[PDB]
PDB file of N, CA and C and ligand atoms in Angstrom:
ATOM      1  N   UNK A   1     102.615 -29.834  -0.237  1.00 55.20           N
ATOM      2  CA  UNK A   1     101.516 -30.277  -1.105  1.00 55.20           C
ATOM      3  C   UNK A   1     100.396 -30.983  -0.364  1.00 55.20           C
ATOM      4  N   UNK A   2      99.156 -30.698  -0.759  1.00 54.90           N
ATOM      5  CA  UNK A   2      98.019 -31.358  -0.168  1.00 54.90           C
ATOM      6  C   UNK A   2      97.777 -32.753  -0.719  1.00 54.90           C
ATOM      7  N   UNK A   3      98.451 -33.120  -1.795  1.00 53.89           N
ATOM      8  CA  UNK A   3      98.219 -34.423  -2.431  1.00 53.89           C
ATOM      9  C   UNK A   3      98.535 -35.585  -1.509  1.00 53.89           C
ATOM     10  N   UNK A   4      99.443 -35.385  -0.538  1.00 53.77           N
ATOM     11  CA  UNK A   4      99.761 -36.459   0.383  1.00 53.77           C
ATOM     12  C   UNK A   4      98.675 -36.797   1.376  1.00 53.77           C
ATOM     13  N   UNK A   5      97.568 -36.046   1.374  1.00 53.97           N
ATOM     14  CA  UNK A   5      96.481 -36.195   2.308  1.00 53.97           C
ATOM     15  C   UNK A   5      95.158 -36.572   1.640  1.00 53.97           C
ATOM     16  N   UNK A   6      95.169 -36.878   0.347  1.00 54.95           N
ATOM     17  CA  UNK A   6      93.927 -37.046  -0.421  1.00 54.95           C
ATOM     18  C   UNK A   6      94.048 -38.268  -1.291  1.00 54.95           C
ATOM     19  N   UNK A   7      92.935 -38.956  -1.518  1.00 56.44           N
ATOM     20  CA  UNK A   7      92.857 -39.940  -2.595  1.00 56.44           C
ATOM     21  C   UNK A   7      91.412 -39.976  -3.086  1.00 56.44           C
ATOM     22  N   UNK A   8      91.236 -40.340  -4.349  1.00 56.73           N
ATOM     23  CA  UNK A   8      89.927 -40.318  -5.016  1.00 56.73           C
ATOM     24  C   UNK A   8      89.410 -41.733  -5.182  1.00 56.73           C
ATOM     25  N   UNK A   9      88.271 -42.026  -4.575  1.00 58.22           N
ATOM     26  CA  UNK A   9      87.608 -43.319  -4.721  1.00 58.22           C
ATOM     27  C   UNK A   9      86.440 -43.178  -5.668  1.00 58.22           C
ATOM     28  N   UNK A  10      85.679 -44.253  -5.899  1.00 59.84           N
ATOM     29  CA  UNK A  10      84.490 -44.138  -6.741  1.00 59.84           C
ATOM     30  C   UNK A  10      83.479 -43.120  -6.192  1.00 59.84           C
ATOM     31  N   UNK A  11      83.455 -42.900  -4.870  1.00 59.07           N
ATOM     32  CA  UNK A  11      82.414 -42.054  -4.275  1.00 59.07           C
ATOM     33  C   UNK A  11      82.798 -40.597  -4.160  1.00 59.07           C
ATOM     34  N   UNK A  12      84.070 -40.242  -4.256  1.00 59.99           N
ATOM     35  CA  UNK A  12      84.492 -38.872  -4.028  1.00 59.99           C
ATOM     36  C   UNK A  12      85.926 -38.829  -3.630  1.00 59.99           C
ATOM     37  N   UNK A  13      86.276 -37.958  -2.725  1.00 57.26           N
ATOM     38  CA  UNK A  13      87.664 -37.841  -2.264  1.00 57.26           C
ATOM     39  C   UNK A  13      87.729 -38.097  -0.779  1.00 57.26           C
ATOM     40  N   UNK A  14      88.643 -38.973  -0.370  1.00 54.08           N
ATOM     41  CA  UNK A  14      88.918 -39.185   1.059  1.00 54.08           C
ATOM     42  C   UNK A  14      90.043 -38.218   1.428  1.00 54.08           C
ATOM     43  N   UNK A  15      89.721 -37.235   2.293  1.00 53.20           N
ATOM     44  CA  UNK A  15      90.652 -36.246   2.842  1.00 53.20           C
ATOM     45  C   UNK A  15      91.039 -36.703   4.252  1.00 53.20           C
ATOM     46  N   UNK A  16      92.309 -36.920   4.463  1.00 54.16           N
ATOM     47  CA  UNK A  16      92.833 -37.426   5.737  1.00 54.16           C
ATOM     48  C   UNK A  16      93.337 -36.233   6.532  1.00 54.16           C
ATOM     49  N   UNK A  17      92.783 -36.053   7.741  1.00 56.69           N
ATOM     50  CA  UNK A  17      93.087 -34.911   8.588  1.00 56.69           C
ATOM     51  C   UNK A  17      93.560 -35.374   9.957  1.00 56.69           C
ATOM     52  N   UNK A  18      94.199 -34.444  10.657  1.00 54.41           N
ATOM     53  CA  UNK A  18      94.501 -34.623  12.086  1.00 54.41           C
ATOM     54  C   UNK A  18      94.045 -33.361  12.779  1.00 54.41           C
ATOM     55  N   UNK A  19      93.118 -33.492  13.705  1.00 52.22           N
ATOM     56  CA  UNK A  19      92.438 -32.347  14.285  1.00 52.22           C
ATOM     57  C   UNK A  19      93.062 -31.976  15.635  1.00 52.22           C
ATOM     58  N   UNK A  20      92.996 -30.703  15.989  1.00 57.02           N
ATOM     59  CA  UNK A  20      93.223 -30.232  17.333  1.00 57.02           C
ATOM     60  C   UNK A  20      92.009 -29.418  17.728  1.00 57.02           C
ATOM     61  N   UNK A  21      91.316 -29.773  18.802  1.00 55.89           N
ATOM     62  CA  UNK A  21      90.108 -29.018  19.189  1.00 55.89           C
ATOM     63  C   UNK A  21      90.456 -27.788  20.000  1.00 55.89           C
ATOM     64  N   UNK A  22      89.420 -27.083  20.432  1.00 54.78           N
ATOM     65  CA  UNK A  22      89.580 -25.932  21.319  1.00 54.78           C
ATOM     66  C   UNK A  22      90.409 -24.805  20.686  1.00 54.78           C
ATOM     67  N   UNK A  23      90.431 -24.689  19.367  1.00 54.80           N
ATOM     68  CA  UNK A  23      91.300 -23.722  18.702  1.00 54.80           C
ATOM     69  C   UNK A  23      90.660 -22.355  18.639  1.00 54.80           C
ATOM     70  N   UNK A  24      91.483 -21.349  18.315  1.00 55.15           N
ATOM     71  CA  UNK A  24      90.926 -20.001  18.183  1.00 55.15           C
ATOM     72  C   UNK A  24      90.020 -19.860  16.959  1.00 55.15           C
ATOM     73  N   UNK A  25      90.291 -20.612  15.905  1.00 58.09           N
ATOM     74  CA  UNK A  25      89.560 -20.488  14.658  1.00 58.09           C
ATOM     75  C   UNK A  25      89.624 -21.840  13.973  1.00 58.09           C
ATOM     76  N   UNK A  26      88.537 -22.238  13.312  1.00 57.38           N
ATOM     77  CA  UNK A  26      88.589 -23.457  12.519  1.00 57.38           C
ATOM     78  C   UNK A  26      89.291 -23.136  11.222  1.00 57.38           C
ATOM     79  N   UNK A  27      90.436 -23.782  10.990  1.00 60.03           N
ATOM     80  CA  UNK A  27      91.239 -23.475   9.798  1.00 60.03           C
ATOM     81  C   UNK A  27      92.290 -24.551   9.621  1.00 60.03           C
ATOM     82  N   UNK A  28      92.795 -24.648   8.397  1.00 58.01           N
ATOM     83  CA  UNK A  28      93.931 -25.481   8.075  1.00 58.01           C
ATOM     84  C   UNK A  28      95.195 -24.767   8.533  1.00 58.01           C
ATOM     85  N   UNK A  29      96.008 -25.421   9.336  1.00 56.73           N
ATOM     86  CA  UNK A  29      97.248 -24.832   9.843  1.00 56.73           C
ATOM     87  C   UNK A  29      98.497 -25.524   9.343  1.00 56.73           C
ATOM     88  N   UNK A  30      98.371 -26.643   8.641  1.00 54.02           N
ATOM     89  CA  UNK A  30      99.585 -27.307   8.193  1.00 54.02           C
ATOM     90  C   UNK A  30      99.309 -28.629   7.502  1.00 54.02           C
ATOM     91  N   UNK A  31     100.403 -29.257   7.130  1.00 51.55           N
ATOM     92  CA  UNK A  31     100.438 -30.578   6.548  1.00 51.55           C
ATOM     93  C   UNK A  31     101.427 -31.383   7.374  1.00 51.55           C
ATOM     94  N   UNK A  32     101.054 -32.585   7.731  1.00 49.85           N
ATOM     95  CA  UNK A  32     101.911 -33.558   8.397  1.00 49.85           C
ATOM     96  C   UNK A  32     102.488 -34.462   7.323  1.00 49.85           C
ATOM     97  N   UNK A  33     103.786 -34.284   7.042  1.00 50.83           N
ATOM     98  CA  UNK A  33     104.399 -35.001   5.943  1.00 50.83           C
ATOM     99  C   UNK A  33     104.652 -36.467   6.189  1.00 50.83           C
ATOM    100  N   UNK A  34     104.741 -36.901   7.449  1.00 50.14           N
ATOM    101  CA  UNK A  34     104.937 -38.315   7.734  1.00 50.14           C
ATOM    102  C   UNK A  34     103.620 -39.070   7.783  1.00 50.14           C
ATOM    103  N   UNK A  35     102.589 -38.469   8.369  1.00 50.72           N
ATOM    104  CA  UNK A  35     101.302 -39.124   8.482  1.00 50.72           C
ATOM    105  C   UNK A  35     100.412 -38.939   7.241  1.00 50.72           C
ATOM    106  N   UNK A  36     100.796 -38.046   6.333  1.00 49.75           N
ATOM    107  CA  UNK A  36      99.937 -37.816   5.161  1.00 49.75           C
ATOM    108  C   UNK A  36      98.565 -37.296   5.538  1.00 49.75           C
ATOM    109  N   UNK A  37      98.570 -36.273   6.390  1.00 49.38           N
ATOM    110  CA  UNK A  37      97.314 -35.692   6.859  1.00 49.38           C
ATOM    111  C   UNK A  37      97.421 -34.175   6.893  1.00 49.38           C
ATOM    112  N   UNK A  38      96.277 -33.520   6.681  1.00 50.56           N
ATOM    113  CA  UNK A  38      96.147 -32.062   6.856  1.00 50.56           C
ATOM    114  C   UNK A  38      95.898 -31.762   8.328  1.00 50.56           C
ATOM    115  N   UNK A  39      96.666 -30.828   8.879  1.00 52.19           N
ATOM    116  CA  UNK A  39      96.477 -30.407  10.276  1.00 52.19           C
ATOM    117  C   UNK A  39      95.383 -29.358  10.315  1.00 52.19           C
ATOM    118  N   UNK A  40      94.259 -29.664  10.986  1.00 52.65           N
ATOM    119  CA  UNK A  40      93.095 -28.765  11.053  1.00 52.65           C
ATOM    120  C   UNK A  40      92.829 -28.413  12.509  1.00 52.65           C
ATOM    121  N   UNK A  41      92.837 -27.128  12.816  1.00 50.40           N
ATOM    122  CA  UNK A  41      92.384 -26.608  14.098  1.00 50.40           C
ATOM    123  C   UNK A  41      90.887 -26.472  14.032  1.00 50.40           C
ATOM    124  N   UNK A  42      90.223 -26.857  15.097  1.00 49.46           N
ATOM    125  CA  UNK A  42      88.765 -26.832  15.153  1.00 49.46           C
ATOM    126  C   UNK A  42      88.333 -26.006  16.361  1.00 49.46           C
ATOM    127  N   UNK A  43      87.527 -24.962  16.093  1.00 46.63           N
ATOM    128  CA  UNK A  43      87.065 -24.059  17.155  1.00 46.63           C
ATOM    129  C   UNK A  43      85.783 -24.612  17.776  1.00 46.63           C
ATOM    130  N   UNK A  44      85.944 -25.711  18.503  1.00 47.48           N
ATOM    131  CA  UNK A  44      84.869 -26.406  19.189  1.00 47.48           C
ATOM    132  C   UNK A  44      85.494 -27.215  20.304  1.00 47.48           C
ATOM    133  N   UNK A  45      84.767 -27.488  21.358  1.00 46.66           N
ATOM    134  CA  UNK A  45      85.274 -28.405  22.411  1.00 46.66           C
ATOM    135  C   UNK A  45      85.163 -29.843  21.920  1.00 46.66           C
ATOM    136  N   UNK A  46      85.990 -30.751  22.371  1.00 48.25           N
ATOM    137  CA  UNK A  46      85.894 -32.151  21.929  1.00 48.25           C
ATOM    138  C   UNK A  46      84.925 -32.979  22.776  1.00 48.25           C
ATOM    139  N   UNK A  47      83.713 -32.490  22.915  1.00 49.92           N
ATOM    140  CA  UNK A  47      82.650 -33.148  23.662  1.00 49.92           C
ATOM    141  C   UNK A  47      81.383 -33.181  22.819  1.00 49.92           C
ATOM    142  N   UNK A  48      80.600 -34.252  22.994  1.00 49.18           N
ATOM    143  CA  UNK A  48      79.273 -34.391  22.378  1.00 49.18           C
ATOM    144  C   UNK A  48      79.321 -34.288  20.851  1.00 49.18           C
ATOM    145  N   UNK A  49      80.405 -34.784  20.246  1.00 48.21           N
ATOM    146  CA  UNK A  49      80.543 -34.731  18.799  1.00 48.21           C
ATOM    147  C   UNK A  49      80.730 -33.338  18.229  1.00 48.21           C
ATOM    148  N   UNK A  50      80.988 -32.332  19.060  1.00 49.59           N
ATOM    149  CA  UNK A  50      80.988 -30.942  18.608  1.00 49.59           C
ATOM    150  C   UNK A  50      82.184 -30.635  17.706  1.00 49.59           C
ATOM    151  N   UNK A  51      83.355 -31.216  17.983  1.00 48.74           N
ATOM    152  CA  UNK A  51      84.481 -31.003  17.076  1.00 48.74           C
ATOM    153  C   UNK A  51      84.227 -31.677  15.734  1.00 48.74           C
ATOM    154  N   UNK A  52      83.612 -32.873  15.733  1.00 48.86           N
ATOM    155  CA  UNK A  52      83.266 -33.531  14.479  1.00 48.86           C
ATOM    156  C   UNK A  52      82.270 -32.703  13.675  1.00 48.86           C
ATOM    157  N   UNK A  53      81.261 -32.157  14.344  1.00 44.22           N
ATOM    158  CA  UNK A  53      80.261 -31.340  13.654  1.00 44.22           C
ATOM    159  C   UNK A  53      80.897 -30.112  13.041  1.00 44.22           C
ATOM    160  N   UNK A  54      81.783 -29.432  13.792  1.00 45.56           N
ATOM    161  CA  UNK A  54      82.390 -28.217  13.290  1.00 45.56           C
ATOM    162  C   UNK A  54      83.322 -28.533  12.130  1.00 45.56           C
ATOM    163  N   UNK A  55      84.082 -29.628  12.242  1.00 46.21           N
ATOM    164  CA  UNK A  55      84.957 -30.041  11.176  1.00 46.21           C
ATOM    165  C   UNK A  55      84.173 -30.267   9.880  1.00 46.21           C
ATOM    166  N   UNK A  56      83.061 -31.001   9.960  1.00 47.31           N
ATOM    167  CA  UNK A  56      82.251 -31.277   8.775  1.00 47.31           C
ATOM    168  C   UNK A  56      81.653 -30.002   8.222  1.00 47.31           C
ATOM    169  N   UNK A  57      81.186 -29.116   9.095  1.00 47.65           N
ATOM    170  CA  UNK A  57      80.611 -27.845   8.635  1.00 47.65           C
ATOM    171  C   UNK A  57      81.630 -27.063   7.827  1.00 47.65           C
ATOM    172  N   UNK A  58      82.842 -26.979   8.338  1.00 45.47           N
ATOM    173  CA  UNK A  58      83.895 -26.211   7.695  1.00 45.47           C
ATOM    174  C   UNK A  58      84.163 -26.733   6.286  1.00 45.47           C
ATOM    175  N   UNK A  59      84.342 -28.058   6.145  1.00 44.46           N
ATOM    176  CA  UNK A  59      84.695 -28.607   4.846  1.00 44.46           C
ATOM    177  C   UNK A  59      83.493 -28.662   3.912  1.00 44.46           C
ATOM    178  N   UNK A  60      82.259 -28.837   4.438  1.00 45.93           N
ATOM    179  CA  UNK A  60      81.105 -28.759   3.556  1.00 45.93           C
ATOM    180  C   UNK A  60      81.007 -27.379   2.932  1.00 45.93           C
ATOM    181  N   UNK A  61      81.239 -26.331   3.725  1.00 45.20           N
ATOM    182  CA  UNK A  61      81.219 -24.971   3.185  1.00 45.20           C
ATOM    183  C   UNK A  61      82.335 -24.773   2.167  1.00 45.20           C
ATOM    184  N   UNK A  62      83.548 -25.258   2.474  1.00 44.35           N
ATOM    185  CA  UNK A  62      84.684 -25.061   1.579  1.00 44.35           C
ATOM    186  C   UNK A  62      84.464 -25.753   0.236  1.00 44.35           C
ATOM    187  N   UNK A  63      84.018 -26.995   0.246  1.00 46.64           N
ATOM    188  CA  UNK A  63      83.956 -27.782  -0.975  1.00 46.64           C
ATOM    189  C   UNK A  63      82.608 -27.700  -1.666  1.00 46.64           C
ATOM    190  N   UNK A  64      81.565 -27.203  -0.993  1.00 46.19           N
ATOM    191  CA  UNK A  64      80.224 -27.227  -1.587  1.00 46.19           C
ATOM    192  C   UNK A  64      79.694 -28.621  -1.843  1.00 46.19           C
ATOM    193  N   UNK A  65      79.957 -29.546  -0.936  1.00 46.01           N
ATOM    194  CA  UNK A  65      79.582 -30.937  -1.105  1.00 46.01           C
ATOM    195  C   UNK A  65      79.415 -31.535   0.280  1.00 46.01           C
ATOM    196  N   UNK A  66      78.621 -32.589   0.367  1.00 45.47           N
ATOM    197  CA  UNK A  66      78.445 -33.318   1.615  1.00 45.47           C
ATOM    198  C   UNK A  66      79.757 -33.941   2.060  1.00 45.47           C
ATOM    199  N   UNK A  67      80.061 -33.784   3.345  1.00 46.77           N
ATOM    200  CA  UNK A  67      81.265 -34.321   3.959  1.00 46.77           C
ATOM    201  C   UNK A  67      80.846 -35.211   5.106  1.00 46.77           C
ATOM    202  N   UNK A  68      81.321 -36.446   5.124  1.00 45.19           N
ATOM    203  CA  UNK A  68      81.025 -37.384   6.203  1.00 45.19           C
ATOM    204  C   UNK A  68      82.325 -37.903   6.781  1.00 45.19           C
ATOM    205  N   UNK A  69      82.302 -38.256   8.060  1.00 44.08           N
ATOM    206  CA  UNK A  69      83.463 -38.886   8.661  1.00 44.08           C
ATOM    207  C   UNK A  69      83.359 -40.381   8.411  1.00 44.08           C
ATOM    208  N   UNK A  70      84.283 -40.929   7.664  1.00 42.67           N
ATOM    209  CA  UNK A  70      84.235 -42.359   7.384  1.00 42.67           C
ATOM    210  C   UNK A  70      85.038 -43.167   8.370  1.00 42.67           C
ATOM    211  N   UNK A  71      86.077 -42.581   8.977  1.00 41.93           N
ATOM    212  CA  UNK A  71      86.868 -43.238  10.016  1.00 41.93           C
ATOM    213  C   UNK A  71      87.388 -42.192  10.982  1.00 41.93           C
ATOM    214  N   UNK A  72      87.536 -42.590  12.244  1.00 42.46           N
ATOM    215  CA  UNK A  72      88.137 -41.723  13.257  1.00 42.46           C
ATOM    216  C   UNK A  72      87.179 -40.836  13.991  1.00 42.46           C
ATOM    217  N   UNK A  73      85.895 -41.220  14.100  1.00 45.75           N
ATOM    218  CA  UNK A  73      84.947 -40.408  14.853  1.00 45.75           C
ATOM    219  C   UNK A  73      85.455 -40.051  16.246  1.00 45.75           C
ATOM    220  N   UNK A  74      86.137 -40.985  16.929  1.00 47.03           N
ATOM    221  CA  UNK A  74      86.622 -40.709  18.290  1.00 47.03           C
ATOM    222  C   UNK A  74      88.132 -40.595  18.365  1.00 47.03           C
ATOM    223  N   UNK A  75      88.775 -40.301  17.243  1.00 51.89           N
ATOM    224  CA  UNK A  75      90.215 -40.127  17.154  1.00 51.89           C
ATOM    225  C   UNK A  75      90.538 -38.707  16.698  1.00 51.89           C
ATOM    226  N   UNK A  76      91.773 -38.289  16.924  1.00 56.03           N
ATOM    227  CA  UNK A  76      92.247 -37.048  16.302  1.00 56.03           C
ATOM    228  C   UNK A  76      92.503 -37.235  14.814  1.00 56.03           C
ATOM    229  N   UNK A  77      92.816 -38.441  14.384  1.00 55.86           N
ATOM    230  CA  UNK A  77      93.069 -38.772  12.975  1.00 55.86           C
ATOM    231  C   UNK A  77      91.763 -39.211  12.364  1.00 55.86           C
ATOM    232  N   UNK A  78      91.251 -38.432  11.440  1.00 58.60           N
ATOM    233  CA  UNK A  78      89.941 -38.659  10.857  1.00 58.60           C
ATOM    234  C   UNK A  78      90.064 -38.691   9.351  1.00 58.60           C
ATOM    235  N   UNK A  79      89.309 -39.573   8.719  1.00 60.62           N
ATOM    236  CA  UNK A  79      89.213 -39.592   7.264  1.00 60.62           C
ATOM    237  C   UNK A  79      87.824 -39.125   6.908  1.00 60.62           C
ATOM    238  N   UNK A  80      87.797 -38.114   6.040  1.00 61.23           N
ATOM    239  CA  UNK A  80      86.559 -37.459   5.616  1.00 61.23           C
ATOM    240  C   UNK A  80      86.267 -37.815   4.167  1.00 61.23           C
ATOM    241  N   UNK A  81      85.104 -38.274   3.889  1.00 58.48           N
ATOM    242  CA  UNK A  81      84.695 -38.485   2.502  1.00 58.48           C
ATOM    243  C   UNK A  81      83.981 -37.229   2.054  1.00 58.48           C
ATOM    244  N   UNK A  82      84.509 -36.617   0.984  1.00 58.30           N
ATOM    245  CA  UNK A  82      83.870 -35.471   0.330  1.00 58.30           C
ATOM    246  C   UNK A  82      83.150 -36.057  -0.867  1.00 58.30           C
ATOM    247  N   UNK A  83      81.830 -36.140  -0.791  1.00 58.42           N
ATOM    248  CA  UNK A  83      81.053 -36.920  -1.750  1.00 58.42           C
ATOM    249  C   UNK A  83      80.950 -36.195  -3.087  1.00 58.42           C
ATOM    250  N   UNK A  84      81.154 -36.940  -4.185  1.00 57.45           N
ATOM    251  CA  UNK A  84      80.853 -36.480  -5.524  1.00 57.45           C
ATOM    252  C   UNK A  84      81.752 -35.386  -6.048  1.00 57.45           C
ATOM    253  N   UNK A  85      82.958 -35.247  -5.518  1.00 56.32           N
ATOM    254  CA  UNK A  85      83.955 -34.232  -5.871  1.00 56.32           C
ATOM    255  C   UNK A  85      85.160 -34.969  -6.455  1.00 56.32           C
ATOM    256  N   UNK A  86      85.924 -34.295  -7.307  1.00 57.52           N
ATOM    257  CA  UNK A  86      87.167 -34.849  -7.819  1.00 57.52           C
ATOM    258  C   UNK A  86      88.363 -34.334  -7.028  1.00 57.52           C
ATOM    259  N   UNK A  87      89.438 -35.108  -7.116  1.00 56.09           N
ATOM    260  CA  UNK A  87      90.669 -34.706  -6.450  1.00 56.09           C
ATOM    261  C   UNK A  87      91.162 -33.367  -6.973  1.00 56.09           C
ATOM    262  N   UNK A  88      91.021 -33.124  -8.275  1.00 52.11           N
ATOM    263  CA  UNK A  88      91.414 -31.824  -8.822  1.00 52.11           C
ATOM    264  C   UNK A  88      90.660 -30.690  -8.164  1.00 52.11           C
ATOM    265  N   UNK A  89      89.346 -30.853  -8.012  1.00 51.08           N
ATOM    266  CA  UNK A  89      88.512 -29.837  -7.383  1.00 51.08           C
ATOM    267  C   UNK A  89      88.921 -29.612  -5.941  1.00 51.08           C
ATOM    268  N   UNK A  90      89.189 -30.690  -5.233  1.00 52.13           N
ATOM    269  CA  UNK A  90      89.577 -30.575  -3.819  1.00 52.13           C
ATOM    270  C   UNK A  90      90.901 -29.831  -3.677  1.00 52.13           C
ATOM    271  N   UNK A  91      91.884 -30.172  -4.527  1.00 55.68           N
ATOM    272  CA  UNK A  91      93.168 -29.468  -4.501  1.00 55.68           C
ATOM    273  C   UNK A  91      92.982 -27.977  -4.762  1.00 55.68           C
ATOM    274  N   UNK A  92      92.142 -27.611  -5.732  1.00 57.75           N
ATOM    275  CA  UNK A  92      91.915 -26.194  -6.016  1.00 57.75           C
ATOM    276  C   UNK A  92      91.393 -25.473  -4.789  1.00 57.75           C
ATOM    277  N   UNK A  93      90.408 -26.058  -4.123  1.00 56.52           N
ATOM    278  CA  UNK A  93      89.810 -25.388  -2.985  1.00 56.52           C
ATOM    279  C   UNK A  93      90.752 -25.335  -1.789  1.00 56.52           C
ATOM    280  N   UNK A  94      91.520 -26.393  -1.538  1.00 57.99           N
ATOM    281  CA  UNK A  94      92.449 -26.342  -0.419  1.00 57.99           C
ATOM    282  C   UNK A  94      93.533 -25.300  -0.655  1.00 57.99           C
ATOM    283  N   UNK A  95      93.881 -25.052  -1.904  1.00 57.70           N
ATOM    284  CA  UNK A  95      94.945 -24.092  -2.204  1.00 57.70           C
ATOM    285  C   UNK A  95      94.456 -22.654  -2.224  1.00 57.70           C
ATOM    286  N   UNK A  96      93.155 -22.412  -2.018  1.00 56.58           N
ATOM    287  CA  UNK A  96      92.639 -21.037  -1.921  1.00 56.58           C
ATOM    288  C   UNK A  96      93.186 -20.420  -0.653  1.00 56.58           C
TER     289      UNK A  96
HETATM  290 NA1   NA B 101      84.070 -34.256  18.720  1.00 57.10          NA
END
């Protein structure tokens, strides 16, 4: 379940991810059940903010909403705020 990686605040949904850069394709590859994070491969090098940019691009396209990194800019563990979306909407899109 993706519910272990999401929570809904007044501003939108905080999606908790753990990234691996340099991947063949930017995509969701799993769920980390202990850390409560979605495992996301990112097809970008981890230099000059490029993995962060690609990560945000991917989720902005998926959710149709602005996505910002609220924590973990320089970590593999990142929390993304998906602005103005509900948890129900986020679950629907992640399950596509
Ligand atoms: Na980066």
